[PDB]
Amino acid sequence: AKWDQWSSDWQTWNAKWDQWSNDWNAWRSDWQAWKDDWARWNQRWDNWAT
């Protein structure tokens, strides 16, 4: 009962954590894609100015 309820509760937690982890992964990839766009825009303006 108790150890089976706890194993269920731990599975449910793990599922919640995994989905959060995936979302932070996705956000990380979005930040790196942003950082690449940022670099590319600086370049475009450097060429434009010089």
Interface residues with a second copy (CB under 8 A) are 2-7, 9-10, 12-14, 16-18, 20-21, 23-25, 27-28, 30-32, 34-35, 37-39, 41-42, 44-46, 48-50
Q: How far is the CB of 8 from a second copy (least distance, A)?
A: 11
Q: How far is the CB of 34 from a second copy (least distance, A)?
A: 5
How does DSSP assign the chain, residue by residue?
A: -HHHHHHHHHHHHHHHHHHHHHHHHHHHHHHHHHHHHHHHHHHHHHHHH-
For residue 27, how far is the Cα from the chain centroid? 3
Q: How far is the CB of 26 from a second copy (least distance, A)?
A: 9
